Amino acid sequence: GEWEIIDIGPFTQNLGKFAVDEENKIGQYGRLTFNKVIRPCMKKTIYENEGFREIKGYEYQLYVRASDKLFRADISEDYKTRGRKLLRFNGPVPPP
Amino acid sequence: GEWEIIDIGPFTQNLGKFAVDEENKIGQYGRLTFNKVIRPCMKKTIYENEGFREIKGYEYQLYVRASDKLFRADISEDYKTRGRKLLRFNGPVPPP
């Protein structure tokens, strides 16, 4: 459904932490140290159905600084169970 | 560095066409046929000096359907000259 830019407050930073933690479990970029999530941060709201406002979940697209390098991460969250998954983690990328 | 999501009106579509035209000149992605720019479309305002008012130009991050595949393209536009450049182009990427 809809997209919006969100600020980089505690909630967002904690999404970055989730992303680094999970990537660290995967191990493709070594041992990473979360530094910071930077602007911009995009949120997509995913609705359960056309015609209705029930929210199925969200996707977040982040730029996350870890171990002095900048990466892109995409994170899904289920509205109901609050489960999050790391959909993509890529970099180093150039600064936005 | 300041961001906003913009709609995919004729202006934006024309940016898509420019991206495909330019990529076609470059030839690193084959011979492409522009179809459509889809949501979401992010516009960055680029200031001459960060924290200060004067606008140097803009950057547009697009999702562009060409030849039935989806690519990511970033386009800069200079505020004073209106010159545009294709900063990058890649894909195929999964739908946002």
Burial class of A73 by CB neighbour count within 10 A (0 to 12, 13 to 18, 19+): buried
Q: Which domains does chain A have, with CATH numbers?
A: 1-96 (3.10.450.10)
Residues of A in contact with B1 (CB under 8 A): 39, 96
Chain A nearest CA to B5, separation (Å): 7
Find tokens 């894909």 and name the residue.
B91
Residues of B in contact with A39 (CB under 8 A): 1, 3
- Tell me the technique behind this structure: X-ray
Interface test with A, best of B3, B44, B74 (most A CBs within 10 A): B3
Tell me how far CA of residue A20 lies from CA of A25, A79, B9, in angstroms: 9, 21, 37
A60 closest CA partner among A48, A77, A47, A83: A77
Residue A39, CB half-sphere, CA atoms under 13 Å: how many? 12
Find tokens 């509205």 and name the residue.
A79
Closest residue in B to A41 (Cα–Cα): B3
Which amino acid, residue A11?
F
Give me the DSSP letters along chain A: --EEEE--SHHHHHHHHHHHHHHHHH-TT-S--EEEEEEEEEEEEEESSTT---EEEEEEEEEEEETTEEEEEEEEEETTT--EEEEEEE------
Question: Cα-flanking dihedrals φ and ψ of residue B57, to 5°?
Answer: 175, -160
Residues of A in contact with B4 (CB under 8 A): 5
| CA A89 – CA A72 distance, rounded (Å) | 6
| A21-24, long-range: CB < 8 A, 24+ apart | A22/A86, A22/A89, A23/A73, A23/A86, A23/A89
B43 closest CA partner among B85, B2, B93, B10: B2
Q: Could you give the maximum distance between any two Cα atoms of chain B, in Å?
A: 42
What are the tokens at A82? 């609050």
Q: Are A63 and A38 in contact (CB under 8 A)?
A: yes
| CA A17 – CA A20 distance, rounded (Å) | 5
Q: Are A75 and A68 in contact (CB under 8 A)?
A: no
| B1-4, long-range: CB < 8 A, 24+ apart | B1/A39, B1/A96, B1/B44, B1/B46, B1/B47, B1/B50, B2/B44, B2/B45, B2/B47, B3/A5, B3/A39, B3/A40, B3/B42, B3/B43, B3/B44, B3/B45, B4/A5, B4/B42, B4/B43, B4/B45
